[PDB]
Each structure stands twice: as structure tokens, then as C-alpha cells.
Design a binder for this molecule. Structure first.
Ligand SMILES: O=C(O)[C@@H](c1ccc(OCc2ccc3ccccc3n2)cc1)C1CCCC1
Ligand SMILES: O=C(O)[C@@H](c1ccc(OCc2ccc3ccccc3n2)cc1)C1CCCC1
Ligand SMILES: O=C(O)[C@@H](c1ccc(OCc2ccc3ccccc3n2)cc1)C1CCCC1
Ligand SMILES: CCCCCCCCO[C@@H]1O[C@H](CO)[C@@H](O)[C@H](O)[C@H]1O
Ligand SMILES: CCCCCCCCO[C@@H]1O[C@H](CO)[C@@H](O)[C@H](O)[C@H]1O
Ligand SMILES: CCCCCCCCO[C@@H]1O[C@H](CO)[C@@H](O)[C@H](O)[C@H]1O
Lengths: 143, 143, 143
């Protein structure tokens, strides 16, 4: 598929981007001394450190939003790649998603003013919606 | 694959169904004035609106359950499609999952009496379990 | 693909492992009488049972970590299988992930001392990182 290399590049970068969030989460837990498990807290200073922290919670929300958005893209974009779309159009779909999602993480973890984060979220969803509809038509017509 | 069009139809509809939940979540946050981020709250009335809401939490639980169930289906159903199953049997697997999952969201967000939601959850898991076992046998025998 | 049977075996076992966590979660909710929904609580003893429980929360954290790690593997490992890697090397990637993830669930739900869980988490991520980089190179060179 001509679109597949671009899809695999963008998707893998987004998986790596999620791994970055996972690592940041751990770093914040250690720095802020905020653990979700007693066994963790007892290792890292005592039971008083089994507690919630706003920065940790923020990291978790960013990671969750990633899972809600990037995982569908992994599916939709893979299938879309094999439908034989216009190369440039396909690239635009993938680039809008990649840029939008990277911007989303920056806006979330960087605590940027509203509605920057929400805009990046919505924007990145648009190529996903587009791919979804295209797959729907292709699937339905092949029934 | 003869089963693949039906799989792609059901899967894409389920992705769209998850997007519907994502949009509803936002609508409920705005209507109930309940935001998870201070930057959101300050935009939408003040810091007192950085708060939890039962309806918002319900939306999040529905979306989470979707991610726990639909994402495995996206994987299992794709692989299963290429194993050359009986067309009608394959359709039944996909339809049970689709109907069960749509019913699940309705039961969750509609606050239907127990155990309606839990039944739909369990029911929809059954075709997934079936596909999983079939893939296990095929994979193992090809080792 | 020569690596594909091993990938499909390990992946399906991990999906089943996640289903086990889902079932355990339900069992713990019923045993500890801790429900997230009023409709559930009213069915199972009264409104006082709409409450949080540490064991339930632990189950949810284990399931969430699974979704953060196993879902990327489902994607990365599938693509990696088609890149024509060394059979034994591919097997090692998949086995390290499988063993690491099973150990992770045991360490989490079994409340094993730190840093056993965190080590298993980190260890299992290493083959994923490896596959991600390999896909990046292949994708980039095919642009
Ligand atoms: O939740 C936990 O178990 C801990 C924890 C432990 C390890 C973490 O990143 C590993 C990781 C994540 C992603 C990777 C991607 C590629 C390669 C290695 C990777 N490695 C994060 C949190 C925290 C709580 C106690 C101490 C920190
Ligand atoms: O969490 C947030 O960032 C906000 C928010 C912002 C946007 C939302 O839906 C976008 C969306 C979702 C799914 C889509 C699927 C297809 C096409 C467009 C799509 N667009 C939801 C919540 C809420 C908090 C502050 C205001 C609401
Ligand atoms: O959250 C809920 O809806 C309930 C609930 C209900 C059912 C559950 O496992 C089903 C399941 C899960 C995974 C499967 C995998 C294969 C085959 C059947 C499978 N079946 C768990 C929790 C709990 C709250 C009220 C009572 C328990
Ligand atoms: C893909 C991973 C991107 C990580 C984005 C990290 C954004 C760091 O941005 C930082 O955010 C802080 C608030 O959290 C601010 O105090 C700093 O001014 C800002 O530099
Ligand atoms: C795929 C998306 C399906 C959305 C299902 C929304 C269900 C709306 O159902 C509504 O639920 C309310 C309680 O929340 C009740 O007050 C109403 O009687 C009922 O109509
Ligand atoms: C793939 C699913 C694996 C489930 C792992 C369950 C681990 C059970 O392990 C149990 O944990 C208890 C604490 O929770 C301890 O009291 C027990 O000593 C221990 O046997």
C-alpha cells in the first residue's frame, strides 16, 4: 500500500509519544512523592505518600485521552491505508492527527490556557472521523 | 476474506459509537459545569467548577468499559476474519458483539436497572471469548 | 510470516489474561460489596454499597496498566511480524513481553513488595521499544 509507510511512521511515533507520557507519570510520582499503592509508598518514604497529586492526575488524564484517541487511529489508519486513498490526502490525514496529538500532550502537561487543549483534541479527531466514514462505505458496499 | 466486510462494518460503527460517548462526556461537563482541569473551570465560570459530577463519572466509566472490550474485539475480529470461518457464524459473532455493546451504552448512560448493563457486558464478551479460543488453536497448530 | 503464529499465540493469551482481570474485578466488587453505580448497589444490598474499595481500585489499576501496555503490543507485534525478523529473536521479544505481563498482574493483584511490579512493567516495555524502533526504521526508509 502506498499510504502504509506514512501510516506506520506516524503511528509508531504516537506509540512512542504515549511511552513518554508513561515515563513522565513515573517521574512525577517520584518527584511529588505521590503513589497509588501502599507497597510503593513504603518503599519511597512511608505510608503518608500513598496519596493523590494534581500533577499525577493530570498525567493520567493525558494518557487516558491518548488511549481513547490514538488506539482508534491505529485501527482506522491501518484499514484506510489498504483502501487505496490519494497519497497526499492520506498523508494529510496522518499528519493532522500526529501534529494534533503531539500538541494535545504539550497543551495538557504544559497546562496551557483553554481552549487550546480541547481544540487540538477536536482537530485531531477530524481525520479519524473522515477515515471511519470512508471505511464504513467500503465495508458496506462489499457486504 | 469473506467475513472481513462484516467485521469492518461492525468495528467502525463501534468506533463511531465510542466517539458518541466522547462527545456526550463533553456535553455533560458543560451542562453540569464539572471540569477536571482548573484551566477548563476558569474558562467556564470559575474555580468552583473544577469538581467531580456523578453523570460525568458515569460517562467516563462507560467509555472505559468500551476501551476494555471493543479494543480487544478490533484485534480478535480482524484476525478471526482471516481464519476462513463460516460466513453466517462470523456474522453472528460480530452482530452479537455490536448489538450487545450498543445496548451496554444505552443501559449505562440511561441508568437502566441492574442487571441489564452487566448482562449486555457478559453477553458481548461471549463472541470475543469464542474468537480468542479459535485464534489460540490456529496459532498453536502453526507453531 | 514465520513469526506470526508465535505473535498470535502470545497476544491472544494476553487478551485472555485481561479478561481474567475483568472477571476478578467483578468478583471483588461482589465479595467486598463495593459498586460504582447506585443501580448496582441497590441490587446488591442497598445504597451504602455504592462506595470505593482499595482492592477494587487495585484491580482497576492493573487493568488500566494492561490497556496502556498490551494494546500497543498488539499493534507493534503484528507489524513487526511482517518485517521478516529472525525467528528466535522474534520469539524472545514476544516471550519476554508475555512473561513480564503475566508477572505484572501477579505482582499487582498479589500485592508483592516494591519494586517487583515496577520491574516487570519496565522489563516488558523493552521488547515493545525494540519493535517500535525497528518499525520506525522500516517505515521511514519506505517513504
Ligand atoms: O507505576 C509504576 O509502576 C512506577 C513506574 C515504573 C516505570 C515507569 O516507566 C517504565 C517504562 C515506561 C515506558 C517505557 C517505554 C519504553 C521502554 C521502557 C519503558 N519503561 C513508570 C512508572 C511508578 C510508581 C513507583 C515508581 C514510579
Ligand atoms: O475534555 C475536553 O477537552 C473537553 C471536550 C472537548 C471536545 C470533546 O469532543 C471532541 C470530539 C470528540 C470526538 C469526535 C469524533 C469525531 C469528530 C469530532 C470529535 N470531536 C469532548 C470533550 C471538555 C472539557 C472542557 C469542555 C468540554
Ligand atoms: O461492572 C459490572 O458490570 C459487573 C461485572 C459483570 C461482569 C463481569 O465479567 C463479565 C465477563 C468479563 C470478561 C469475560 C471474558 C470472556 C467471557 C465472558 C466474560 N464475562 C465483570 C463485572 C460488576 C458490578 C456488578 C456486579 C459485578
Ligand atoms: C510528548 C511529551 C511532551 C511533554 C510536554 C511537557 C510540557 C512542559 O512545559 C512546561 O509545563 C509546566 C507546567 O506543567 C510549566 O511550568 C512550564 O512553563 C512549561 O515549560
Ligand atoms: C450510543 C449512545 C447511546 C446514548 C444513550 C443515552 C440514553 C438516554 O436515555 C435517557 O437516560 C436518562 C438518564 O441518564 C433518563 O432520564 C431518560 O429517561 C432516558 O431517556
Ligand atoms: C492472571 C491473573 C493472576 C491473578 C494473580 C492473583 C494473585 C493471588 O495472590 C494472593 O494475593 C493475596 C493479596 O491480594 C495474598 O493475600 C495471597 O497470599 C496471595 O496468594
Amino acid at each position: 500500500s502506498p499510504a502504509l509507510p506514512a501510516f506506520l511512521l506516524c503511528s509508531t511515533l504516537l506509540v512512542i509519544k504515549m511511552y513518554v507520557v508513561a515515563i513522565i507519570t513515573g517521574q512525577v510520582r517520584l518527584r511529588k512523592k505521590a503513589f497509588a499503592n501502599p507497597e510503593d509508598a513504603l518503599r519511597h518514604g512511608g505510608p503518608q505518600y500513598c496519596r493523590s497529586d494534581p500533577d499525577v492526575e493530570r498525567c493520567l488524564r493525558a494518557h487516558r485521552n491518548d488511549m481513547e484517541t490514538i488506539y482508534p487511529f491505529l485501527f482506522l489508519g491501518f484499514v484506510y491505508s489498504f483502501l487505496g486513498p490519494n497519497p497526499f490526502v492520506a498523508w494529510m490525514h496522518f499528519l493532522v492527527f500526529l501534529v494534533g496529538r503531539v500538541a494535545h500532550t504539550v497543551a495538557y502537561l504544559g497546562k496551557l490556557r483553554a481552549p487550546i487543549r480541547s481544540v487540538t483534541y477536536t482537530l485531531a479527531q477530524l481525520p479519524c472521523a473522515s477515515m471511519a466514514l470512508q471505511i464504513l462505505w467500503e465495508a458496506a458496499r462489499h457486504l
